[PDB]
Amino acid sequence: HSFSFYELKNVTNNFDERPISVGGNKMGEGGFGVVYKGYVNNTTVAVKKLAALKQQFDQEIKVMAKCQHENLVELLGFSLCLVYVYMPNGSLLDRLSCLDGTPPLSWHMRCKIAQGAANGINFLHENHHIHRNIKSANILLDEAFTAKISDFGLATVMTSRIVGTTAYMAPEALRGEITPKSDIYSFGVVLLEIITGLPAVDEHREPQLLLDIKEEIEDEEKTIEDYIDKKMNDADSTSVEAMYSVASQCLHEKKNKRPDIKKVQQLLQEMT
Amino acid sequence: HSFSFYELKNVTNNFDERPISVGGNKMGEGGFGVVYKGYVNNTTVAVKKLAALKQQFDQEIKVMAKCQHENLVELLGFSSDLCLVYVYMPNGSLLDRLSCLDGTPPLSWHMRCKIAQGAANGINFLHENHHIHRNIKSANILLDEAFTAKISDFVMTSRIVGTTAYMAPEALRGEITPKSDIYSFGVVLLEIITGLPAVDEHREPQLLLDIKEEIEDEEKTIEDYIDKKMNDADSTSVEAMYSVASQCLHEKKNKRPDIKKVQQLLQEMT
């Protein structure tokens, strides 16, 4: 679908730069532009106005055209601007950290979100795309807390342009390779966030990278039990250990030793 | 020791920016400056003129005053009118010698082993004095007239720019630690074995450290990669050094040996 630039301008209050916290329309910065909350028809939408180009714009639509799935953020249209289905519950990162005082997600709900995110990655890989920025801040949650993968801004093959969020990036990705195996790795870090409720990096924490508690648990210096988010009351040890096992396998340093997204799906389905 | 800026200017030919190989005095660019060949007082010297602070100029002179060792490049003095003066290493870098730059003969296997040892010693001295080098690579390993190894020059969405070829994964993430120095040294051992450069944009694989995966997966053997420009490499000792290299190149920083263990394994090897 195609929107008028006039409409977008106004339904977002001329791109009001103030945070929604204050009553403005500014929802975030990312995906190479700024994201404003807007109202089209009687439905709320997310409006990205591009900033640091046109290649990025055409490319983002080309990838959106092939990839629509239940667990991916649906591109509604365009206008220079882009328009998405609005997800009222924000990022998985926000919810895990209970930002703004929202209630901690239950284990059952966390499990659903992990299955959802994985089905949406499985759809990307089936259709031969790579996301390259799988991280909890890019997993959105709609009104039902369905996982919706977002910010397709970055979606043997090498690249001179190495990019991603380094706390989530696989070692071959860090070196510049481009392969679906790296998405799996990043998803491993996302699972660790879900199990623990801890951010992927914490300057003031030992270890600073969440992905490093994997070694701590292998060397038996720690246990999964030690790291399980305490902000829930329904997380039985069997299914928690089941999900940690998946995370562990995603986090293998040798890309070929990693599960493909489909056995990731199978393992999280078996989890419940 | 301390120098005159103009005597330094004089003996470097007005700091002739042209490279040595066409008759200038520029040897390289590094350590936040340009390095020139100079001569004075019956001493050939290397001069690094800092370019765009003085705390840092005085901060290295601290580091250098402490760290004097047979396998570290020695600081001879300084000028503040900004220049650091070093001992000149007439056989240039390990990289140059591995690549037989300018027609120089290949280094034998036996010599390569000595150099590997010498570098591990210099790295050991650094880590014992709680120093992270951050830039172990074969172009930073100089060779003196006797081919003694002299070590020298010591998270939202983003893109990396750092020279991936030598850097460990945790270092690319931003961690700063001596276990990274070890990983880089592993790449250097692979250079010593293969004669190959760490990265080659027109090679499969581009990064040298990837042959470790090729070998583990039994798609290749370390023999297939042995520098053919040697006639004294016995497979037993080569396989020994390769094993040291493989361990340094461990993907998780805590499974790698510390520099003391690298010294031992390298010693047993001869």
Side-chain angles (χ1 to χ4, degrees):
Chain A
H1 189 281
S2 169
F3 297 95
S4 176
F5 180 80
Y6 174 94
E7 191 169 6
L8 271 37
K9 202 186 196 67
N10 299 257
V11 288
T12 58
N13 296 283
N14 296 118
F15 302 106
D16 196 348
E17 213 70 20
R18 286 132 44 71
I20 319 96
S21 69
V22 195
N25 288 85
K26 180 169 180 161
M27 278 166 48
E29 309 188 70
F32 295 102
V34 177
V35 177
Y36 307 83
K37 162 181 287 184
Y39 317 90
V40 178
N41 271 286
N42 201 343
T43 127
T44 294
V45 299
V47 189
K48 189 179 71 180
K49 193 183 61 180
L50 268 58
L53 201 317
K54 166 76 178 305
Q55 282 300 55
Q56 181 80 11
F57 170 85
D58 300 287
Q59 288 187 352
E60 156 143 16
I61 317 188
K62 169 212 55 111
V63 172
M64 244 38 130
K66 275 292 180 177
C67 313
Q68 289 191 14
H69 185 264
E70 165 66 3
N71 298 101
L72 311 172
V73 168
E74 186 183 356
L75 182 70
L76 285 183
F78 51 80
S79 162
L80 199 160
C81 301
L82 277 168
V83 171
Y84 313 83
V85 176
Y86 173 64
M87 319 314 274
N89 282 306
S91 76
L92 171 56
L93 174 62
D94 295 338
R95 287 319 105 222
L96 283 169
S97 71
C98 302
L99 187 66
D100 287 350
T102 67
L105 313 158
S106 70
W107 175 250
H108 172 250
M109 192 42 64
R110 281 165 208 228
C111 282
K112 154 178 203 207
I113 291 163
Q115 285 156 5
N119 294 344
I121 298 176
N122 171 82
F123 185 84
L124 298 170
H125 293 185
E126 276 181 16
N127 291 81
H128 309 283
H129 280 41
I130 310 181
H131 190 270
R132 303 210 303 176
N133 211 4
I134 296 295
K135 66 190 197 187
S136 66
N138 289 341
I139 300 177
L140 289 196
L141 302 166
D142 67 4
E143 293 90 331
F145 286 87
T146 304
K148 308 246 173 195
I149 304 193
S150 186
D151 191 357
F152 295 78
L154 293 183
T156 270
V157 182
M158 292 296 286
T159 180
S160 295
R161 163 219 184 54
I162 307 180
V163 32
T165 304
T166 54
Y168 290 91
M169 297 178 68
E172 72 283 357
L174 289 170
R175 290 165 206 304
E177 168 171 5
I178 308 206
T179 156
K181 301 169 187 149
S182 297
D183 284 359
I184 301 313
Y185 190 90
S186 294
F187 186 65
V189 177
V190 173
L191 301 174
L192 289 187
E193 292 175 82
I194 296 174
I195 296 172
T196 71
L198 304 166
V201 65
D202 190 337
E203 158 167 17
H204 310 292
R205 171 185 72 200
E206 187 57 44
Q208 303 167 280
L209 300 169
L210 188 53
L211 61 75
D212 270 318
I213 66 170
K214 179 189 171 192
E215 191 186 72
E216 277 190 321
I217 291 163
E218 296 181 359
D219 302 319
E220 308 188 12
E221 325 169 11
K222 299 308 201 60
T223 73
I224 316 167
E225 275 292 333
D226 296 323
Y227 276 106
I228 304 184
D229 188 347
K230 282 164 189 170
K231 296 161 283 185
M232 51 195 177
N233 75 327
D234 62 326
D236 71 289
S237 280
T238 285
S239 69
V240 172
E241 288 163 19
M243 182 185 290
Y244 172 80
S245 180
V246 174
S248 195
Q249 293 166 75
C250 295
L251 281 169
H252 201 299
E253 291 299 319
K254 298 187 158 83
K255 65 170 172 292
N256 306 340
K257 293 279 168 54
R258 290 180 215 149
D260 57 49
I261 192 51
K262 309 79 195 180
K263 80 195 55 149
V264 173
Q265 260 175 314
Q266 292 178 282
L267 290 168
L268 301 173
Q269 276 172 57
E270 295 175 338
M271 194 190 59
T272 79
Chain B
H1 194 276
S2 103
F3 297 86
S4 169
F5 183 89
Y6 273 65
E7 274 198 356
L8 275 186
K9 172 196 175 42
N10 251 8
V11 310
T12 70
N13 210 33
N14 183 98
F15 292 93
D16 188 312
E17 210 89 10
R18 295 179 296 172
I20 292 285
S21 83
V22 323
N25 297 61
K26 175 181 172 181
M27 328 188 60
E29 307 185 18
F32 307 96
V34 176
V35 173
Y36 306 68
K37 178 163 175 173
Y39 171 89
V40 57
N41 303 334
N42 293 289
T43 317
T44 292
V45 309
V47 190
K48 174 175 73 175
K49 189 193 64 164
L50 277 51
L53 164 160
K54 189 175 195 299
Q55 289 188 312
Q56 182 157 1
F57 161 87
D58 287 328
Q59 264 170 358
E60 183 175 325
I61 313 187
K62 158 194 182 169
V63 166
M64 293 319 238
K66 288 205 293 194
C67 297
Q68 293 174 5
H69 185 276
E70 156 120 41
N71 292 107
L72 296 181
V73 168
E74 175 185 21
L75 179 57
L76 279 171
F78 59 89
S79 187
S80 50
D81 295 320
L82 282 56
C83 294
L84 290 173
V85 188
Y86 312 81
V87 174
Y88 174 67
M89 304 310 175
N91 280 309
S93 64
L94 176 58
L95 173 57
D96 298 337
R97 280 330 112 217
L98 281 177
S99 76
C100 298
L101 183 59
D102 289 317
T104 63
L107 304 164
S108 81
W109 175 244
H110 176 245
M111 195 68 258
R112 294 175 198 214
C113 287
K114 298 314 256 175
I115 295 168
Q117 275 154 203
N121 286 348
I123 299 180
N124 174 80
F125 180 96
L126 290 183
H127 290 192
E128 277 184 342
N129 286 252
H130 306 279
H131 248 285
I132 305 180
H133 189 290
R134 309 271 298 278
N135 249 288
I136 299 303
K137 58 182 189 174
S138 62
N140 276 340
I141 301 175
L142 299 181
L143 301 169
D144 70 4
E145 213 177 320
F147 292 93
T148 286
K150 305 289 193 174
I151 287 175
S152 87
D153 194 5
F154 61 87
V155 189
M156 64 184 210
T157 302
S158 53
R159 64 163 305 154
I160 317 82
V161 192
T163 292
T164 44
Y166 286 93
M167 290 179 100
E170 75 271 355
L172 290 177
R173 287 182 217 283
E175 315 201 350
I176 287 142
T177 156
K179 300 145 192 173
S180 290
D181 278 353
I182 295 306
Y183 184 98
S184 291
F185 189 61
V187 178
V188 177
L189 294 178
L190 291 189
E191 282 181 272
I192 282 172
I193 291 167
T194 57
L196 291 180
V199 65
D200 185 343
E201 192 174 285
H202 309 308
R203 176 180 67 193
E204 185 59 61
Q206 296 183 24
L207 308 173
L208 179 51
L209 65 86
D210 272 332
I211 63 159
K212 169 177 164 275
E213 192 212 335
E214 288 194 342
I215 290 158
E216 268 155 34
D217 289 8
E218 289 171 341
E219 309 161 358
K220 297 295 174 178
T221 72
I222 182 52
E223 294 285 330
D224 297 318
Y225 278 112
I226 297 215
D227 191 343
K228 296 175 328 194
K229 296 192 301 297
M230 307 185 288
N231 61 14
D232 62 323
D234 60 281
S235 52
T236 279
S237 78
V238 168
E239 264 144 47
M241 189 187 270
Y242 176 85
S243 175
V244 168
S246 197
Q247 304 171 50
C248 298
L249 290 175
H250 204 301
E251 32 282 289
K252 290 302 285 182
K253 61 180 166 163
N254 287 343
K255 303 301 165 193
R256 306 169 200 160
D258 71 280
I259 181 62
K260 87 177 93 178
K261 188 184 189 171
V262 164
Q263 285 183 287
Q264 173 201 334
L265 291 173
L266 281 181
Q267 271 9 69
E268 283 154 22
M269 183 190 64
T270 56

